[PDB]
Design an enzyme around this catalytic site. Sequence first.
Site, PDB file in Angstrom:
ATOM      1  N   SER A  86       0.804  -1.241  -0.026  1.00  0.00           N
ATOM      2  CA  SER A  86      -0.117   0.113   0.061  1.00  0.00           C
ATOM      3  C   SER A  86       0.794   1.502  -0.105  1.00  0.00           C
ATOM      4  CB  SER A  86      -0.951  -0.078   1.233  1.00  0.00           C
ATOM      5  OG  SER A  86      -1.563   1.168   1.386  1.00  0.00           O
ATOM      6  N   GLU A  89      14.625  -5.114 -18.347  1.00  0.00           N
ATOM      7  CA  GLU A  89      14.189  -4.572 -19.488  1.00  0.00           C
ATOM      8  C   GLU A  89      13.499  -3.128 -18.969  1.00  0.00           C
ATOM      9  OE1 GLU A  89      14.563  -5.853 -23.516  1.00  0.00           O
ATOM     10  OE2 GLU A  89      15.977  -5.668 -21.993  1.00  0.00           O
TER      11      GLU A  89
END
Lengths: 433, 432, 428, 428, 116
Positions: free
Chosen positions: A133, A247
Amino acid sequence: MRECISVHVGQAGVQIGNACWELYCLEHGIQPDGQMPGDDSFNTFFSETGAGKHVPRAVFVDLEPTVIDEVRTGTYRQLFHPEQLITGKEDAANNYARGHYTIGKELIDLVLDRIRKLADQCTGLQGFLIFHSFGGGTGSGFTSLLMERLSVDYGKKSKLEFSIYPAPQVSTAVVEPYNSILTTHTTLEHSDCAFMVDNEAIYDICRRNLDIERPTYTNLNRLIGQIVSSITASLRFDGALNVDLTEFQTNLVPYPRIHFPLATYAPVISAEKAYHEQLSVAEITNACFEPANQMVKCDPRHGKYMACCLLYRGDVVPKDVNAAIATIKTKRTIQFVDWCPTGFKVGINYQPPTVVPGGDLAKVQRAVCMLSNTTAIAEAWARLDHKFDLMYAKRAFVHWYVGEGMEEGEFSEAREDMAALEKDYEEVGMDSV
Amino acid sequence: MRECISVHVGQAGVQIGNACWELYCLEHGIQPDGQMPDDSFNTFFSETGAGKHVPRAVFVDLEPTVIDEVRTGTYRQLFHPEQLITGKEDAANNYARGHYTIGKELIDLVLDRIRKLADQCTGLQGFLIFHSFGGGTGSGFTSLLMERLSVDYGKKSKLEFSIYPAPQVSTAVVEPYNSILTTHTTLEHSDCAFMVDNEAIYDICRRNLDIERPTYTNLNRLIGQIVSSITASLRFDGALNVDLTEFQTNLVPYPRIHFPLATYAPVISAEKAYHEQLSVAEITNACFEPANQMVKCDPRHGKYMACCLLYRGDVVPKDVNAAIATIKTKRTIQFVDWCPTGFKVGINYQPPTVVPGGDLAKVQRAVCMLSNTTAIAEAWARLDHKFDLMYAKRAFVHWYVGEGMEEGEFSEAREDMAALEKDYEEVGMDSV
Amino acid sequence: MREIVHLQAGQCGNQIGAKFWEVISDEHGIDPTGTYHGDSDLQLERINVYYNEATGGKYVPRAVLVDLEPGTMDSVRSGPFGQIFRPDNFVFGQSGAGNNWAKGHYTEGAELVDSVLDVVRKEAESCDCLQGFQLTHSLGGGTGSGMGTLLISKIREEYPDRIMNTFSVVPSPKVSDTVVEPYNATLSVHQLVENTDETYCIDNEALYDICFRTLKLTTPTYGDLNHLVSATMSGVTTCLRFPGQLNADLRKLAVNMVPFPRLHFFMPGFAPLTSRGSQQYRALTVPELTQQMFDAKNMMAACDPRHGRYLTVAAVFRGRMSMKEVDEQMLNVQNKNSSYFVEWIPNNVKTAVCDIPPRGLKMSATFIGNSTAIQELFKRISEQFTAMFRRKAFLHWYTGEGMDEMEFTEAESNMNDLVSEYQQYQDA
Amino acid sequence: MREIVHLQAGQCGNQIGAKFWEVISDEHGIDPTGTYHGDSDLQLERINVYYNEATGGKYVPRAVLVDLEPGTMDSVRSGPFGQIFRPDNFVFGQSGAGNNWAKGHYTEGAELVDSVLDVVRKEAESCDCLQGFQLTHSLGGGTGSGMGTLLISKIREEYPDRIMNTFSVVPSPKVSDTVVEPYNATLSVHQLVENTDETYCIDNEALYDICFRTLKLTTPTYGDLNHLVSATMSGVTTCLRFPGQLNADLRKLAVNMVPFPRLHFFMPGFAPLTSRGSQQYRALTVPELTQQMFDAKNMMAACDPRHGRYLTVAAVFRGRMSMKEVDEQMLNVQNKNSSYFVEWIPNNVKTAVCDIPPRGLKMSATFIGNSTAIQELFKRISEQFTAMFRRKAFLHWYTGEGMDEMEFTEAESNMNDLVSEYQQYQDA
Amino acid sequence: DEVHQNQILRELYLKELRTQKLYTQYHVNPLRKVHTIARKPMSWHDNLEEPADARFLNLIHHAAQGPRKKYPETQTEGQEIGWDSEPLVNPQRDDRRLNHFRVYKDITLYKAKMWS
Ligand SMILES: Nc1nc2c(ncn2[C@@H]2O[C@H](COP(=O)(O)OP(=O)(O)OP(=O)(O)O)[C@@H](O)[C@H]2O)c(=O)[nH]1
Ligand SMILES: Nc1nc2c(ncn2[C@@H]2O[C@H](COP(=O)(O)OP(=O)(O)OP(=O)(O)O)[C@@H](O)[C@H]2O)c(=O)[nH]1
Ligand SMILES: Nc1nc2c(ncn2[C@@H]2O[C@H](COP(=O)(O)OP(=O)(O)O)[C@@H](O)[C@H]2O)c(=O)[nH]1
Ligand SMILES: Nc1nc2c(ncn2[C@@H]2O[C@H](COP(=O)(O)OP(=O)(O)O)[C@@H](O)[C@H]2O)c(=O)[nH]1
Ligand SMILES: [Mg+2]
Ligand SMILES: [Mg+2]
């Protein structure tokens, strides 16, 4: 071989990944206990033990013992190795000080130890997926204790991050702007990529596209489940251009501090709409950049679109993409960046988007997870900062935050470092000349 | 590939469409749901997988009722939620609420669904709008729509088919008010706006097809066959063809006289045709028949700026040229002096269809007769004085000026439509 | 989702609106409590307008009963269809009004005002589209006059874009069962005209006079009068509960009708009001229901249409029909009678047809007209007013209360301004 | 797991807690003997929060029954659910405290406090990880205010890290049945601001309003009131026992809910309260539940929140519901009433959801609020105290047992310090 | 007036119980969305065997079906259009001798992919 540990910490993240680990049980043939009545593919998420049981790789943490207990008293108890499901003894009580300096300095060891065990059981560890959260005590304070202690151990290995950010005005906590700012003080310097969502925009996304009104937190979590299943799609089933966890951590992040991309799903659709719409590669690509499908509830029209990555799943003919992604550039309403002309990344998996039974996402043959590093998130940060200035000026909600083992001066440090992020996100809003 | 995004604003549009889309389906072959039990469909339909041949019309109205009847009819599967757009509370016959209030909280949406439907198309060639000229939806909303279209679709056709505020029969009291303000707007846009007032059609139904029950259903069906014919060349194929763009630069005379008058040729019934012919000529002659016209305006009191005939059936081009000649050897039929030639004529073999239930019976041929008559001034003049009489004693004006439009607007329109009349007789003045 | 809130206001409404909530029930297909015994899907497709879906079907109405006297709603509750209403919207004060407008608008009003607007506020919040606050009072009495105009004046100060359709019994000459009847119109019309949008007027006289020619019934109770006035108010709002081939909501039946922001007193009527020995010998088509709608014999307000000039008329039809047949019938009325239509409005109609017909009737229609001859009514109560104000008549109850005399001078003045404005547009 | 030591204190407190163990035993499925006979297994997974373990598979309550007056504990053991309590937890003395704060704090009450600490310390140190001690006390007398705050100031130093839930019956404004009522409260708020962390204060008067008028009981006995206050006690500790979505416990409902340390005097309220006639028409869904929470007519404290602004609001919902509707509608009840809320805290809500609905209710939500309007309860006691203390009235009982007027002065000084504290962060 | 205020409410509440007719039948509208709430995937609170309604499947399916089958008449405008949607006789939509449909040829099949 191509493996990653998913640490679902906090009461938010345990139910975010509650349906994620269900969803990985649909892609692979993993039953609700773990058996197939295959191949290499079930490796990044599940392990293999003896008989044919596939133990997952999850480090489910909740510092209160309320929700993980239902995972270990539910219909997938046999699935998870019961060491993985780790509870505490009492909550964090929406307190950064409680989740990080007191209750949590107890659960820290066992939690860290579990990861040493789940890591020394792997040979291809490529990253740490942590779901938390920003507003609750566990999802702001205890996940910060993980992020900082993960650095002196395992290290520069990627620490990809999904979290539900404080919604603009539609919020289910009060002191939540206090917890969110203190989180960024200990998450900017450690989290490599920190892929963002909030709660608000998804309710709208399954209000107009899916016409399922009054959505709950389980509808709201299964969509994140399809987000993470296309981000981790290439450390699995094969295809065209394939993207590992490294990536995204060189193509979606300009500068060191600026590492907060924004995640959208394209085929948000029901049974009746999908019968009446052939989602080709063309319109599925345009629907991503429309400013009501962003899962952050911001106006991307206001901001730059610095770094962008488009994933794919299914019958994605290469050509279509290049053409589709080009149309997006030409359009001047899709405003872009001249200090990086390239901007764009493609990745195509051949596994179709799986459909979870008892769901509303219709089975589609193509999907896009459009990860965008825009600067329209600085406006969401600006509305989270004045949300904090008009409370700290008169010292509200401080007595719980200081009695519990946190210095008063950290409020000032979190404040001034967060204003730096606003200035840094504006220095990357100025056209280079 | 030669396609047309249909749009139906207001009850008039939606309902006439419910009778226009039945035609499209039945004709092509699609069953009433979107399941073909050819590539013509690629112009009015989108085959989304299997056989779901989805249509292409953004039906829009500021009240549920009408739209809901389609969202729960024998055609509820033939569309999409975001294509049968509905609204909250009606504009209530107030150009203001349709262009300044209620409507503004629905325009952005309607525009987007057209953008989507535009992206899909390979080559757009006409946004056929369908308004009613006299309400808040089919006039005030149509204004904001056509207006915006001329800021994104820019130079693209928008051929419209509205119901003219008829002279006598008028089921509305603010009927004249809306028309003038609307015309003002639908003049700097509409490339050509056909009109078909209820009166004439209510009448041509009385004799030709002998229906002794003209209802708001049988009427819309004939309006359908007009659009069918207009866009049959960009659908089937036969001989000389007419794309939408050609209609404009072959009928619209000057940059404003774009208001043709159409009249289907063989509007015969069923048993009567067992006692009648369909000679390629006969129908073309009967097309000019004063009464058969479907807009209240005898063309005697004016000329024919530029007619444009669209045929359909076994029409040997030989007889076609013979007909347009034997009707030019007639003094009554009178053209303007600034234009000899005659009419741009086209032929599409695909014979007419027969929506089961409608009178219009099977006829080997059919000559839709669109014409730019210079006499429409008559009808226009009537509304100008109707508006005048009322605007004089500021009648039924408080409600408009308390919902957006300023008092100035009413005036601007009055002079605009007055100027219109002047540029409708000046063009008639025998060139000297 | 375009919804209407009902606003009961006294004996001359409680028993009229009771029949209202009985007519709509017997047509939308409900029953004593709530059980839907209906026989079609279309019947239920718009119930969201008038009723509210309760726990497990069994609908509950959007009415609030407002009266100062307790026993006027005990008749409503004990009635055949009295269980329907919410038992917490039966809002009532304690002391009687005594037909006094001051005791209904100034003294014991204010107690039963903040309580009434609370129920009105809650019932208005639970709404999708709000464009109506239909109220049923009577001018002639004191509770309905006192509560009505006071209740009108604060919805307009709270929710000022809503069609305020206020059906009302008017004070009228030949039957007059109240003696301070002139006092309770001029104070009422003063507040009524400048805060309302739609005020379909009835009197007992013509409504009684309908009975003793048309239906030729031997003896009426008020119950048949309520059925004959609730049939109109169902027909006016049928484009909002039922679809058709020309739809027209309440804002359609005002903005296209009322010419100037004073001329909103309209005139009801029901077409096939055929009797018990003449239904067998009469057809059903729009022509035959043109005699029995345009006649003064089925008019309801007070007056004669051939004593003024129609200013704007409409007629919301209901049934399966053709429609040159509505429009030629309308056109021939307007051209064969072009002496009683204002010549400065060239087209004078707004017909609207709703296929869904009335129960037990091939076709029905509701006539509404803005005749100038409402002047016959409004001048008549003023001359009865002037016989009161001059000689200090039944007024010390009013003045001793706290009402100044100047507000009584404002009563004939605005109406004398009103009656001049309604004959000015007759001459033009 | 996470348990609560319940602490019936004072004559009143036995009767509220008896109804607390009437509703919890039904929610947890417990017999009037202790033998579990229920339908689901959720009411065993956190059975250990309130009910302990005994042999024979029987659940005994963790309740400490203390009162100086013996007339209550025989009564709670001669009722419906009486043979559950562990019999030596009844720690009666035999002397009436005479509604005297001096008797119950600085005198004979001190004889019993060391015995009741022993009962508590047995039940507190024999349990895994305690959160705190919910208290139902009685600020009108001496067994309440006296034994209460002395116990409360003799738990916060042995265990100074735990929640101090202090459900209180403050003196009701006009409802008054003790002549020395204002002394006992104003002498006790001092010993209830610096120890407690959550003082949910009730009056009888509003509970008489929500029962007689809102819920419409014909003859409201006192026992009907105790069922209402059991709801706000059961519903504030219900994510802690029963599972679901986003949770809330006492410390959660403290940190987002206590602005500054002396700002904890909260105010309760239930939500799905209906009547007999209005149970079956009212549709139980999330929309209707939100409004009755904020409405002053359903509010267990003598104050409309109109004269003031909520510093913070929580809502702990209970039932199978969505979660868009939970907080989007209360965002609506956050912005539509901007003056009714503070501006120095932009968002003011903690929500919660329990999947398990109540016994015989589809949804529920107890509502707690830190409104500015607490000050009027605390203004009126001070006003009542000044009229009292101005001429040394009713003081020879409150001085003959060790109490000086110097201590009296301090009590008022910190009493009206609180009304300043709830006024400094008012409109400002 | 407080001693009076109790009894005026006492009298009203007694008449409420003398005249009150209870609910009897659960009706449920087939043509309004009842807005189901999703289930937690990993939960024995929710993932149990609770039976479904046999009729509500029939009432939804009857709500689906078609207007051609629901009503043996032509109630409301819009139902008579599309009421009889069958061709009068078999059209034979396959011969080029009478029907003159198009086929896009091989370039015109492909060429649309250049512009799209
Ligand atoms: N979408 C979604 N959001 C959740 C879920 N659970 C929690 N949240 C979000 O988390 C915020 C507060 O919940 P949490 O952060 O999980 O609470 P916590 O981390 O346990 O904090 P403490 O209870 O004090 O220990 C809310 O704003 C929610 O929006 C979930 O299951 N789904
Ligand atoms: N052909 C046809 N004409 C219609 C239809 N409905 C209305 N008209 C005509 O259009 C004129 C004005 O339109 P309206 O009836 O007000 O409907 P609208 O254009 O949608 O305007 P709104 O009522 O504001 O929504 C009327 O006088 C009718 O004569 C229809 O369904 N079919
Ligand atoms: N149509 C109709 N008129 C009624 C009804 N009840 C009373 N009236 C009329 O109301 C007039 C008297 O009004 P009154 O009862 O004093 O009104 P109040 O002050 O609101 O109670 C009489 O002339 C009656 O004709 C009714 O149920 N229907
Ligand atoms: N909590 C509770 N309240 C009571 C009871 N009986 C009376 N009260 C209320 O408590 C107040 C008086 O408190 P009191 O019984 O004297 O408290 P004590 O000092 O413990 O005896 C009055 O306003 C009563 O309304 C009871 O059995 N339980
Ligand atoms: Mg938690
Ligand atoms: Mg309309």
